[PDB]
Design a protein around this ligand. Sequence first.
Ligand code: HEM
Length: 136
Amino acid sequence: LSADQISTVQASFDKVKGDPVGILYAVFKADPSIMAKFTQFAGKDLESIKGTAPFETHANRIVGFFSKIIGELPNIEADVNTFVASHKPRGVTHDQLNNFRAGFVSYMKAHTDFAGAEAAWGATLDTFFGMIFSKM
Ligand code: HEM
């Protein structure tokens, strides 16, 4: 992960960072078992909660932290540590983490011309999920 790849990803992300709700929708849709961990959304229709105030609040927190991480590449260890501390006790699995990744990438492909940033994103996400999976 070097500066050329980091700048590519950060340019790519800048295009979509204003759509937290859409990104979170894509993740929940890829794996409903992620959605079922949120007491506020469990048992409701994703298509119906997507436009509500609670969904936006959550989406802003979650994608907001992801945004922190993308902004500081590659110096991400401390933030991954914080992530693991809050999420390890919620029992998040590797499967769910990989579905988060899949949902995100699906979002990016459906909303930008992704072909040009695809390798850089690969490097970034392999690094990020690489660190998480070494810790939980
Ligand atoms: C993919 C599996 C994941 C699951 C099952 C999951 C689940 C949750 C749950 C249950 C909460 C608490 C909601 C609440 O009570 O308010 C939460 C909050 C949060 N999640 Fe995750 N999450 C996942 C992935 C991620 C990822 C990849 C990030 C990185 C951006 C992230 C960042 C956050 C943040 C910042 C919060 C708010 C602070 C907190 O309560 O921890 N989550 N998530």
